[PDB]
Amino acid sequence: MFYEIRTYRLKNGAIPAYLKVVEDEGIEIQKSHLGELVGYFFSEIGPINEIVHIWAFSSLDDRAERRARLMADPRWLSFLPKIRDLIEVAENKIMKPARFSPLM
Amino acid sequence: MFYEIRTYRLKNGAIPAYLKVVEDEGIEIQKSHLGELVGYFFSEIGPINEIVHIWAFSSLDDRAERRARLMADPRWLSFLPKIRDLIEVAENKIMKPARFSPLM
Amino acid sequence: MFYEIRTYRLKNGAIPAYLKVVEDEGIEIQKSHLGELVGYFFSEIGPINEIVHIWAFSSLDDRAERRARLMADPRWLSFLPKIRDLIEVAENKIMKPARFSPLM
Amino acid sequence: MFYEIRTYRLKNGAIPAYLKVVEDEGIEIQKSHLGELVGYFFSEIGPINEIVHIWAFSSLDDRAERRARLMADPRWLSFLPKIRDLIEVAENKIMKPARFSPLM
Amino acid sequence: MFYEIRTYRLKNGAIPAYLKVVEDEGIEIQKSHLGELVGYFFSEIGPINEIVHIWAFSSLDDRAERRARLMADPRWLSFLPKIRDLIEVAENKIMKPARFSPLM
Amino acid sequence: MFYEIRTYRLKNGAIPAYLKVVEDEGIEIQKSHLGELVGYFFSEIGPINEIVHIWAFSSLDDRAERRARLMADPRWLSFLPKIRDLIEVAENKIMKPARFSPLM
Amino acid sequence: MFYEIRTYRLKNGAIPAYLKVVEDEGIEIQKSHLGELVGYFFSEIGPINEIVHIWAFSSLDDRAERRARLMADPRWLSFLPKIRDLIEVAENKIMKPARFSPLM
Amino acid sequence: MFYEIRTYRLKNGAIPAYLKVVEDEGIEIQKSHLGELVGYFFSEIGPINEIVHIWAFSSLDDRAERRARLMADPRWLSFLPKIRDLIEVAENKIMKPARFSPLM
């Protein structure tokens, strides 16, 4: 399985607002397209104003396929503007599970 | 629940060796002390020679308690030298799960 | 004892304004909740527009408890918006005192 | 008062060794020259293998004066080699105390 | 041959807008002055909101010459304001092709 | 098309040695597996001791497939040790070509 | 002699405006207070939108003295707002000349 | 005029050794090839174990020409190994002087 880890640094103080709108209007739409959400966290100790969420994909072409459909969803497009200015810097990475990882 | 995310950058080319000794001699000892391993990953696309593992703790004082016992385990101390020089740079952070996170 | 070190990078030229409102409306409220302020500094030589303050906690669960109360304080919530846009980037870390540290 | 903050990133796993030799052979020599040690900490949560110590100076020329005598102390010179290879990366910065800082 | 690699970090969510106006109003003007465009990419996995484009120059004085003319082009100056606020951080570097590089 | 950009920071002064052994023993083996090499560069102005090479893949699952075969090649495994210690830090990213990119 | 190196990252595209107002209204005021300007540069190849200027001081307490007077100059205070929002991130450092440095 | 700024981070504690061998065996050879040394500094406050030297070039092709000759000098090649392992990380950048820069 492939694990995508996305890390965002939000505008200082935007985490509460971000998590509210995501919970209320984005996460369900996103999960119906992307598949398996592994974890969704916000900072406590370390980088402040940070969001980290992990998604698992069977293959990377499947990921491309799923993300393409998510991006086409007009409901997703209507949602994006609600967090588009809350996120200042972002990046994502693909990782693989160790043989001894619960996540496989 | 508290989530600790540890990220290491290993010596270039050390991931295979690192994952083998961890699987063979460290992970079980570590899991018997720390409790719940959420995920253990190695790089594929993004930062190279990277290890990322996540652990969940009921409270931070419980984390402190568990890590103190792990550090006292002479089996742990016998193991550490096997990855101590494979890891070049490291850092860890504590995060909290979003209400809509599978991980809670 | 636990030492929390928070480092912020403010909007260029915001330190004077920041330090004035903190002194006038935030530090006392914060101290009555958080406990022991170890030091509060602003840059001179090195990173510019930087704020660094250190707080000591008996335990991390006590820290969590104290910060929860501070976050619940409506006076704190009325103050936050006064520095919320003055801070651009932030992060915090927990450290422990060396046996030979005055700070223990 | 001026506050100098020195931050070092040590070789992975070198904190115990570092703190022991500093306590046993360096800190007293250093304190007799530099004056006031404000705090000496090692990482717990955040950057790993990190040392952070803070020194207060009445003036920066006094700091220069004090550090020149410390560097001239042959006992200091005999000590340095004991942590010179334990430290990988380092940096220091000068800051000033806020009017509401305990540290002034 | 010299290869210049320019990397920009755009405002979160600005890639589509940026790529549209560049395609519609800037790339042709830029190519007629700079010479050979080697590649123009936007992020997918790794740093998000990133643009990376590569240009080849026979010599660095030739590069200077070409960029001077591009900067003098009033059509270029009329275009710049259209992406000037879409780019947050940028940097460029000059590199040389390996003997076994297709790009020479 | 997908473009993978790999950037390495080598041991200070290792570029000549690195480029020689790659040219002599690694690049051909690598190209026979990976497919299309877009460019292979070493620093001149900017980050020093840096290597940047770009590879194009039709799909990411094809990339996975090709890299799996490359990693299985015992000739590749015999070569790796020759640059494994010349590379200090590394990272890779996947990007897409702009519609106006020669590289598509 | 002491050399202070200040490095700023300006808003994308602000260098021309910055350099004009500094030349027209700030540099002379600043030089009459600070003493010896060693060099004032703006980026070309490397970090973009960057300003780097170097000032030489006989002693650090002299630097403190001179900068205090510059900060007190009402003409300086009237000027500051003109570049205060053009500069996004900044930092400064003190260095010493090598015995073989023209700058001593 | 073009200004090249080279910044190196040396092995912890290597500055004295580095500066000695450069003064004794490298700087003169280097100056006879490169032309005008603007300044050569080592850290005091800020990044520790850092070297920063600045060279001025009439044109970038002239710089290429001069550095090619320096690299061909067998005396330079005999010297390089003496600082090659003292330098851990490096980078250089080209900048231009402001109209009001003493350095033009």
Side-chain angles (χ1 to χ4, degrees):
Chain A
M1 198 88 86
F2 290 91
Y3 291 81
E4 162 174 28
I5 303 181
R6 303 177 66 84
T7 302
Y8 314 148
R9 188 193 76 211
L10 312 180
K11 183 271 173 291
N12 178 70
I15 283 183
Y18 174 95
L19 295 173
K20 192 201 179 196
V21 71
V22 168
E23 165 165 36
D24 293 336
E25 315 177 6
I27 197 59
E28 290 310 304
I29 295 172
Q30 180 171 40
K31 292 168 61 187
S32 66
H33 287 286
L34 303 197
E36 307 161 11
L37 172 60
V38 181
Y40 213 119
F41 322 107
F42 56 96
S43 52
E44 178 41 38
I45 296 177
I48 295 176
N49 299 305
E50 194 185 70
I51 292 296
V52 167
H53 48 128
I54 314 173
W55 300 83
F57 294 103
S58 58
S59 71
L60 293 186
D61 278 340
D62 180 61
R63 168 179 174 284
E65 232 205 306
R66 286 175 174 281
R67 292 192 51 79
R69 292 194 278 257
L70 172 69
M71 285 303 305
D73 194 327
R75 297 179 308 167
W76 184 241
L77 304 182
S78 296
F79 165 71
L80 292 186
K82 300 177 196 299
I83 57 172
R84 184 174 54 195
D85 298 316
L86 294 186
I87 299 170
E88 299 187 322
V89 183
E91 68 186 2
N92 65 326
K93 56 182 172 183
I94 294 301
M95 301 192 88
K96 294 188 171 177
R99 291 158 47 83
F100 49 84
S101 182
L103 299 181
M104 279 292 257
Chain B
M1 195 86 82
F2 289 93
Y3 291 81
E4 161 171 34
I5 303 183
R6 303 177 67 80
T7 303
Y8 313 146
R9 191 193 69 207
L10 313 176
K11 182 278 172 286
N12 175 67
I15 284 187
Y18 172 99
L19 294 172
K20 193 204 174 186
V21 71
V22 168
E23 166 171 31
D24 292 335
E25 320 182 359
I27 197 64
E28 289 314 308
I29 295 170
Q30 178 169 44
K31 290 171 62 190
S32 67
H33 287 283
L34 305 192
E36 305 161 16
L37 172 60
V38 179
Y40 212 118
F41 323 107
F42 56 99
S43 60
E44 177 42 39
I45 296 176
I48 297 179
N49 299 304
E50 192 184 72
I51 291 298
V52 169
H53 48 129
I54 312 169
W55 302 79
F57 294 102
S58 60
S59 67
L60 295 182
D61 279 348
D62 181 58
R63 168 174 177 285
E65 231 202 303
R66 287 173 171 290
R67 289 190 57 74
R69 291 193 282 258
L70 173 65
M71 283 306 296
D73 196 323
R75 297 180 306 171
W76 184 243
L77 306 177
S78 301
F79 165 73
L80 290 186
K82 303 174 191 298
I83 57 169
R84 180 173 59 193
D85 298 310
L86 295 181
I87 299 171
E88 306 189 315
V89 185
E91 72 184 1
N92 63 330
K93 55 182 172 186
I94 295 300
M95 300 187 93
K96 292 184 170 178
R99 293 157 46 80
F100 50 83
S101 176
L103 298 182
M104 282 291 270
Chain C
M1 201 87 88
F2 289 89
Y3 290 81
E4 166 173 26
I5 303 182
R6 303 178 70 83
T7 302
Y8 313 147
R9 188 192 75 211
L10 314 179
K11 182 274 174 293
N12 177 66
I15 282 183
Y18 173 96
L19 294 173
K20 192 201 178 198
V21 70
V22 167
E23 165 168 30
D24 295 334
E25 317 183 355
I27 198 58
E28 289 315 309
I29 294 170
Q30 178 171 43
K31 291 170 61 186
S32 70
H33 286 282
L34 299 197
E36 309 161 5
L37 169 62
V38 183
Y40 212 118
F41 323 107
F42 56 98
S43 57
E44 176 43 38
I45 296 180
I48 294 176
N49 300 305
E50 193 183 68
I51 292 294
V52 167
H53 49 126
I54 316 172
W55 301 78
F57 294 101
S58 60
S59 70
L60 294 184
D61 281 341
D62 181 67
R63 166 173 176 290
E65 229 201 310
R66 287 172 174 286
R67 293 187 54 76
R69 291 198 280 253
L70 173 69
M71 282 300 306
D73 195 321
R75 298 178 307 163
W76 183 243
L77 303 180
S78 294
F79 165 71
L80 291 186
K82 301 172 194 297
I83 56 170
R84 180 172 60 194
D85 296 312
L86 295 183
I87 296 168
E88 302 188 315
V89 184
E91 70 187 4
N92 65 328
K93 57 185 169 185
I94 294 299
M95 301 188 95
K96 291 187 174 181
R99 292 157 48 80
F100 49 81
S101 182
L103 297 180
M104 282 292 261
Chain D
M1 197 90 86
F2 291 92
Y3 291 79
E4 162 172 27
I5 304 181
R6 302 178 70 84
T7 302
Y8 314 147
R9 189 193 73 211
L10 313 178
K11 182 273 176 292
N12 178 63
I15 283 188
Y18 173 95
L19 293 172
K20 191 203 176 191
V21 70
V22 166
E23 165 170 30
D24 295 333
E25 314 181 356
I27 197 66
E28 292 312 308
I29 293 168
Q30 178 168 45
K31 290 168 63 186
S32 67
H33 286 285
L34 304 193
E36 308 164 6
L37 168 60
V38 182
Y40 211 116
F41 322 106
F42 55 102
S43 55
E44 178 38 38
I45 298 179
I48 295 178
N49 302 306
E50 191 183 70
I51 291 296
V52 170
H53 50 129
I54 314 167
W55 301 81
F57 293 101
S58 51
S59 68
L60 294 187
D61 282 343
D62 183 62
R63 167 173 176 287
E65 230 205 304
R66 285 179 174 281
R67 292 189 54 81
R69 293 191 281 259
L70 173 66
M71 275 306 288
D73 195 323
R75 298 181 303 163
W76 183 239
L77 303 180
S78 296
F79 166 70
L80 291 183
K82 302 176 193 299
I83 57 174
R84 180 176 55 194
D85 300 310
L86 294 182
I87 297 171
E88 303 186 318
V89 186
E91 71 185 3
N92 64 327
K93 58 184 169 182
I94 295 298
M95 304 190 92
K96 291 185 172 179
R99 294 158 44 83
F100 49 85
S101 180
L103 299 182
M104 286 289 269
Chain E
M1 196 84 89
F2 289 91
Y3 290 79
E4 164 174 29
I5 302 180
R6 304 174 70 78
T7 304
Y8 312 151
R9 191 193 71 209
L10 312 180
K11 184 272 172 287
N12 181 64
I15 282 183
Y18 173 96
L19 291 172
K20 191 195 176 193
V21 68
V22 167
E23 164 167 32
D24 293 331
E25 314 184 357
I27 198 63
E28 288 312 301
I29 294 171
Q30 180 173 41
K31 290 170 62 184
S32 69
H33 288 286
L34 301 197
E36 307 163 6
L37 171 61
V38 182
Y40 213 113
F41 324 102
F42 56 98
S43 58
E44 176 44 34
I45 297 177
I48 293 178
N49 303 307
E50 191 184 70
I51 293 294
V52 166
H53 49 127
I54 314 169
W55 302 79
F57 295 100
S58 59
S59 65
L60 292 187
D61 279 344
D62 181 60
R63 166 175 177 289
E65 230 206 307
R66 287 176 173 282
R67 292 189 53 79
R69 289 193 281 258
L70 174 70
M71 284 309 299
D73 193 324
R75 297 179 305 166
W76 184 240
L77 308 176
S78 301
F79 165 69
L80 291 187
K82 304 173 189 298
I83 60 169
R84 180 173 56 191
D85 295 315
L86 297 181
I87 298 167
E88 302 191 317
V89 184
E91 67 185 7
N92 63 328
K93 56 182 166 186
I94 295 300
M95 302 193 93
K96 290 185 175 179
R99 294 158 47 82
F100 49 81
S101 181
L103 300 180
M104 287 289 275
Chain F
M1 196 86 91
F2 289 90
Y3 291 81
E4 161 171 29
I5 303 181
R6 302 176 69 82
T7 303
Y8 313 146
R9 190 195 70 204
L10 311 178
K11 182 275 176 290
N12 178 66
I15 283 181
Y18 174 92
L19 290 175
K20 191 198 178 195
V21 72
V22 168
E23 171 168 29
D24 292 334
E25 312 185 358
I27 198 58
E28 289 315 307
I29 294 169
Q30 177 166 44
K31 292 168 65 186
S32 66
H33 286 282
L34 305 193
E36 308 166 9
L37 169 59
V38 181
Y40 213 116
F41 323 106
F42 54 99
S43 58
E44 176 43 39
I45 296 179
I48 294 180
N49 300 303
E50 191 183 71
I51 292 295
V52 170
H53 48 126
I54 310 169
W55 301 82
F57 294 101
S58 54
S59 69
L60 294 184
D61 281 346
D62 181 62
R63 170 175 173 288
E65 231 201 302
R66 284 174 176 284
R67 292 190 54 76
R69 292 194 279 260
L70 175 65
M71 292 297 313
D73 195 323
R75 296 179 307 169
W76 184 241
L77 306 177
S78 300
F79 164 72
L80 292 187
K82 301 172 194 299
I83 58 171
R84 185 170 56 188
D85 300 312
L86 298 182
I87 296 170
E88 304 192 318
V89 185
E91 70 185 3
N92 65 327
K93 54 183 175 183
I94 294 301
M95 301 193 90
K96 296 184 170 180
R99 292 156 48 83
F100 48 86
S101 182
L103 297 183
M104 289 288 277
Chain G
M1 193 84 83
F2 290 91
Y3 291 80
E4 162 172 37
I5 301 182
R6 301 177 70 81
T7 301
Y8 312 147
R9 188 194 74 208
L10 312 179
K11 180 274 170 289
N12 181 64
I15 285 182
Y18 172 97
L19 294 171
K20 192 203 178 191
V21 72
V22 168
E23 168 167 27
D24 291 338
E25 314 181 1
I27 196 63
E28 289 313 304
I29 294 172
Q30 178 170 39
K31 291 172 61 185
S32 70
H33 286 285
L34 302 194
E36 307 165 6
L37 171 60
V38 182
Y40 212 119
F41 322 107
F42 55 99
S43 55
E44 178 39 40
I45 297 177
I48 296 180
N49 301 305
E50 195 184 70
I51 291 295
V52 165
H53 49 127
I54 312 170
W55 301 82
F57 294 103
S58 62
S59 69
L60 293 184
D61 278 343
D62 184 60
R63 167 174 176 289
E65 229 200 310
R66 291 174 170 284
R67 292 188 54 74
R69 293 193 276 261
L70 173 66
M71 275 308 283
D73 195 324
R75 294 177 308 169
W76 184 243
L77 307 178
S78 303
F79 165 73
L80 291 188
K82 301 176 192 300
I83 57 171
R84 181 174 58 192
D85 298 311
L86 297 181
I87 298 166
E88 304 187 318
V89 186
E91 70 183 6
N92 63 327
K93 53 182 175 183
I94 294 300
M95 301 191 91
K96 292 187 172 179
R99 291 158 50 78
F100 49 85
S101 183
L103 297 181
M104 286 289 271
Chain H
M1 199 86 90
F2 289 90
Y3 290 81
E4 162 172 31
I5 303 181
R6 302 179 69 85
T7 302
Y8 314 150
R9 189 191 75 209
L10 309 180
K11 182 274 173 292
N12 180 66
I15 283 186
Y18 173 96
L19 291 173
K20 192 199 178 196
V21 71
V22 167
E23 165 171 33
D24 294 335
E25 312 184 1
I27 195 65
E28 290 314 309
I29 297 172
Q30 178 170 44
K31 290 168 67 190
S32 69
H33 286 284
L34 302 194
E36 309 163 10
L37 170 60
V38 178
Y40 213 119
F41 323 106
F42 56 99
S43 56
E44 177 42 39
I45 297 177
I48 293 178
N49 301 306
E50 195 184 70
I51 291 296
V52 168
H53 50 128
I54 312 168
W55 302 81
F57 294 104
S58 58
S59 63
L60 293 186
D61 280 345
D62 181 63
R63 164 172 179 292
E65 228 205 301
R66 284 173 174 282
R67 293 188 52 78
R69 288 194 282 259
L70 173 66
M71 282 304 302
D73 197 326
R75 294 181 307 169
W76 183 241
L77 305 179
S78 302
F79 164 73
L80 291 186
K82 303 173 193 300
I83 56 173
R84 181 173 56 195
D85 299 314
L86 296 185
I87 299 171
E88 304 188 318
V89 186
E91 73 186 357
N92 64 326
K93 56 184 171 186
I94 295 301
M95 300 192 90
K96 291 185 175 181
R99 292 161 43 89
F100 48 85
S101 182
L103 298 180
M104 290 290 274

